[PDB]
Design an enzyme around this catalytic site. Structure first.
Site, PDB file in Angstrom:
ATOM      1  N   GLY A  93      73.705  48.235 112.693  1.00 36.83           N
ATOM      2  CA  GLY A  93      74.926  49.024 112.411  1.00 36.83           C
ATOM      3  C   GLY A  93      75.404  48.891 110.971  1.00 36.83           C
ATOM      4  O   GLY A  93      76.504  49.409 110.657  1.00 36.83           O
ATOM      5  N   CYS A 149      73.471  50.117 108.570  1.00 37.03           N
ATOM      6  CA  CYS A 149      72.889  51.361 107.996  1.00 37.03           C
ATOM      7  C   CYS A 149      74.016  52.171 107.335  1.00 37.03           C
ATOM      8  O   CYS A 149      75.116  52.289 107.934  1.00 37.03           O
ATOM      9  CB  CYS A 149      72.137  52.168 109.049  1.00 37.03           C
ATOM     10  N   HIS A 164      69.223  59.992 109.220  1.00 37.79           N
ATOM     11  CA  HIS A 164      68.705  59.506 110.525  1.00 37.79           C
ATOM     12  C   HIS A 164      69.843  59.358 111.534  1.00 37.79           C
ATOM     13  O   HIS A 164      69.532  59.210 112.710  1.00 37.79           O
ATOM     14  CB  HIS A 164      67.795  58.269 110.399  1.00 37.79           C
TER      15      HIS A 164
END
Ligand SMILES: */C=C/C(=O)O[C@H](C(=O)NCc1cccc(OC)c1OC)c1ccc([N+](=O)[O-])cc1
Ligand SMILES: [Cl-]
Lengths: 305, 300
Positions: free
Chosen positions: A143, A145, A41
């Site tokens: 952030g 991720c 993503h």
């Protein structure tokens, strides 16, 4: 003595964390040998995240559209590819701090350590379980991720988790390092929710054994029971069924304490029926289910890395 | 979202952990530059431990009586001295993995990470606090002696605790890295018991502010309190006195949530009276006191 929610030492994994940037999106990657692993993503904007075609979006991308910092140093991307929901960025330099490692998929009820990171900078480490509903109750602000989960056996890091998204309920969803989701989740801004979670029975029993080993003995009684009788109680209180394999895994703890698993099940039956009557177990008012049998044996034996 | 007991990444501390052996005793040491820090009780026998004379036991030692092992390598000890309750062994190699660090002495209420080690090998990392009675509720088996507690702010490691012993109550006592004990403890096997443990009031308030920030308001009420009235009530539940310092320190979280400190004090007074009525706050059925105002700002 004592008993604490304990994470693996995070040093072998700290030396693999990097920042990955695709235009506007920044998140965490895992640098092992000459590949960086991160959520696919990362290639999506606001536009894209609604209904992404990944193979399509990715075929558009220059190697040079992938900015990769290992601390204060630039890494040259020489290759891109997807495996399921993870993006593999080939780089010009092998990570000199690459530990011995493998990619493994965990079962719900199994525990691991998460190194929370922000812009390839490790920030914190905590111990998690994979819930029966395939979510993790993590602590992630934007952030995080690409933050990973791992176990250590001797010198070998077993990577089991990479963080993809937060669900509207507060809990977290992600993949193994082969990019296969844990649970019925997709990497898309759509309506997604956690299923009804259940309590990990074999873990609660492990934690009752930890309490007995630490001198917290008040919940023990003279009674025994059966799997069938107990599972009728388990089902009633939204507890996972206890299987014969669970009983076998608790074997050692039953030897070391004198409390046969169905003996301790009788104790748990009573705690589910009558409550804890204003008492605590290991400084907890709740029955904790994020310690495995192996977690209890390892912490109460002294095994190192 | 979500709120967990988070420890600091342990890597900068793992690169510093060694095994120190004297006679038949082995525990952990901390290798920073060319110095190894460990508990001075490493030079005691069983029959020394009631009334040890450390300056007498130590003058009888040579350098070569101390085996320092960093992974597979033996370090050569070229010097030894005692400062308070820590032994400082000088070695011939500076630790190439020494981080940016400083020694800090912390006050009750402060949190830190512990790296639990056996035989110089790291076992696990967990977060805890200095209790008001100057003990810590750690997890520590035999041979965990010399394990250290620390904070990391930017890339600087702040060493604040070294583990020396377990009290009969199953709680843990230790020193700063200058070898001064926290609390009235001594490195002797004499009768010593920690003071009554109390709840860290300023931390519970911090964690209630955290719960409001993560969108939880069910425990607020429309009352306020005076500081003095709050402390008269809280001390009846074994809660530490709240001071004007504690009130000033919560200033920022007050302004963030729009809830005055003494209003949140009114909420806690009510929570102590009613309990939770089958509810939880940030996933706890007890009032959590091992997160500081600084920890809540860092994690929210
Ligand atoms: C390095 C750890 C260690 O063994 O230290 C000693 C210790 O803490 N004793 C173990 C102990 C005490 C009381 C009750 C216990 O069981 C519940 C245990 O076993 C866990 C130790 C080191 C140094 C001193 N000292 O002289 O200060 C005392 C004790
Ligand atoms: Cl943790």
């Amino acid at each position: 003595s004592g008993f604490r929610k304990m994470a693996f030492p995070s040093g072998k994994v700290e030396g693999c964390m990097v920042q990955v940037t695709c235009g506007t999106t920044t998140l965490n990657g895992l640098w092992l040998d000459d590949v960086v692993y991160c959520p696919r993503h990362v290639i999506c904007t606001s536009e894209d995240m609604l209904n992404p075609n990944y193979e399509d979006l990715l075929i558009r991308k220059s190697n040079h559209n992938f900015l990769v910092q290992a601390g204060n140093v630039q890494l040259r991307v020489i290759g891109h590819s997807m495996q399921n929901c993870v993006l593999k960025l080939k780089v010009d330099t092998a990570n000199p701090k690459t530990p011995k490692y493998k990619f493994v998929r965990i079962q719900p009820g199994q525990t691991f350590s998460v190194l929370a990171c922000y812009n390839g900078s490790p920030s914190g480490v905590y111990q998690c379980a994979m819930r029966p509903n395939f979510t993790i109750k993590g602590s992630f602000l934007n952030g995080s991720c690409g933050s990973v989960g791992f176990n250590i056996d001797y010198d070998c890091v077993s990577f089991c988790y990479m963080h993809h998204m937060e669900l509207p309920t507060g809990v977290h969803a992600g993949t193994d390092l082969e990019g296969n989701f844990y649970g019925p989740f997709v990497d898309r801004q759509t309506a997604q929710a956690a299923g009804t979670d259940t309590t990990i029975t074999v873990n609660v029993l492990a934690w009752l054994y930890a309490a007995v080993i630490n001198g917290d003995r008040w919940f023990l009684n003279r009674f025994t029971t059966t799997l069938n009788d107990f599972n009728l109680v388990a089902m009633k209180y939204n507890y996972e069924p206890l299987t014969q394999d669970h009983v076998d895994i608790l074997g050692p703890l039953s030897a070391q304490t004198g409390i046969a698993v169905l003996d301790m099940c009788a104790s748990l039956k009573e705690l589910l029926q009558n409550g804890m009557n204003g008492r605590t177990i290991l400084g907890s008012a709740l029955l904790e289910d994020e310690f495995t049998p192996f977690d209890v044996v390892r912490q109460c034996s002294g095994v190192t890395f």
